[PDB]
């Protein structure tokens, strides 16, 4: 009834080449709605097209987003992370070391130091098991506007939040459309669901 695909188990390991790395991920996740395993998105370059992720609705293991220069990770359809397996034994979502510091300037496509600015998870409502680990993302905004209490399942015994808020740039406020000022990005289509 849903499009199924496997995940990966590479963790923080450095890929053979950026050419094979993105091509493999595109081949794996394009069309996929249910990842039966771990969604790992690592070492992705600044201008990497990630539109193949648009259909992903659930991840059965953990989500790892690490060492990316890509400015935005679009997982706007991701509704649920199960935490059937965990990162560092405790975490269902881990966002780590994503890029380089940048000031308040809106990025210039070929000049501006790369790094994750926003984790676009508008549909995320459920984390069944495991916590959230967000560390060392200089350009990342909006982790601290999110109410993770509403996302953690009531049975989640490992509902941990280890969230670093340190930033190189100031965050633009959520759009007024996001009631309660909780959002994943600066757009009105980025509010917490």
């Amino acid at each position: 009834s849903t499009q199924v695909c496997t995940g990966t188990d590479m963790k923080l390991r450095l890929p053979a080449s950026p050419e094979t790395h993105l091509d493999m991920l595109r081949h794996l996740y394009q069309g996929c709605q249910v990842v039966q395993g771990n969604l790992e998105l690592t070492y992705l370059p600044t201008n990497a097209s990630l539109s193949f992720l648009q259909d992903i609705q659930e991840v059965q293991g953990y989500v790892l987003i690490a060492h990316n220069q890509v400015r935005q990770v679009p997982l706007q359809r991701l509704r649920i992370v199960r935490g059937t397996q965990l990162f560092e034994d405790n975490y269902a979502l881990a966002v780590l070391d994503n890029g380089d510091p940048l000031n308040n300037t809106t990025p210039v496509t070929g000049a501006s130091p790369g790094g994750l600015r926003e984790l676009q998870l508008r549909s995320l409502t459920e984390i069944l098991k495991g916590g959230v680990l967000i560390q060392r993302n200089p350009q990342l905004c909006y982790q601290d506007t999110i109410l993770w209490k509403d996302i953690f399942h009531k049975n989640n015994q490992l509902a941990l939040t280890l969230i670093d808020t340190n930033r190189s740039r100031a965050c633009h406020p959520c759009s007024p459309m996001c009631k309660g000022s909780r959002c994943w990005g600066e757009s009105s289509e980025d509010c917490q669901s």
Binding site: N103, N166, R167, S168, R169
Partner: peptide, 9 residues
Amino acid sequence: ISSSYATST
């Protein structure tokens, strides 16, 4: 300057 990331403009 950003206090946390020592980023100066």
